[PDB]
């Protein structure tokens, strides 16, 4: 019904369940950008 993403293919092959553990073991954002925040070095200098 929807677009097959690189995540869907890994799930079919079986790799995905292994990627979640490693990424979670290293505290990485499985399916997301995280909570770190955007780049704010040029913004603090007044970049337009």
């Amino acid at each position: 019904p929807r677009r097959v993403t690189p995540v869907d293919k890994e799930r079919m092959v079986g790799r995905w369940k292994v990627i979640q553990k490693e990424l979670q073991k290293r505290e990485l954002p499985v399916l997301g950008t995280g909570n770190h925040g955007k780049y704010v070095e040029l913004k603090w200098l007044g970049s337009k």
Partner: protein
């Protein structure tokens, strides 16, 4: 004493004894919004059902792909793929392209050089000047 070499294996000849269609999968990506996918939607509703019934040895996967042209990506046994963009093509033009992937193989296109390709030795051995009636200059 005759010692056996353990580094030579047999080679397969597809077609001799049993034939295996190289095309093993066919992806059919369409779009509900793109205008170039209007014909692909017609091929999926009228010509794909029966074309998929006559080829039971091919795995068909119909999935959407918005913001992208429609493509017919076929996967072959050799590991290579062939994707054909069918933008602005009528349904009967999609079927002529789908049959191109079915008949085709993963091998790359090559210029016509020699008709026959053989791997078995010559029934009449290769010419040798020492196995004939001699030649007098």
């Amino acid at each position: 004493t005759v010692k056996a070499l353990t580094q030579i294996s047999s080679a397969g000849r597809n077609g001799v004894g049993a034939f295996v269609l190289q095309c093993k999968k066919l992806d059919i990506h369409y779009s509900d919004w793109a205008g170039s996918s209007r014909g692909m939607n017609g091929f999926i509703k009228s010509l794909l059902p029966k074309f998929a019934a006559a080829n039971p040895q091919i795995e068909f996967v119909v999935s959407p792909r918005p913001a992208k042209h429609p493509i017919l990506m076929g996967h072959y046994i050799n590991g290579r793929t062939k994707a054909i963009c069918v933008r602005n093509m009528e349904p009967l033009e999609i079927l002529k392209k789908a049959e191109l992937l079915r008949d085709a193989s993963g091998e790359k296109p090559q210029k016509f050089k020699k008709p026959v390709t053989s791997t078995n030795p010559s029934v009449r051995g290769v010419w040798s000047p020492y196995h004939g009636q001699g030649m007098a200059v």
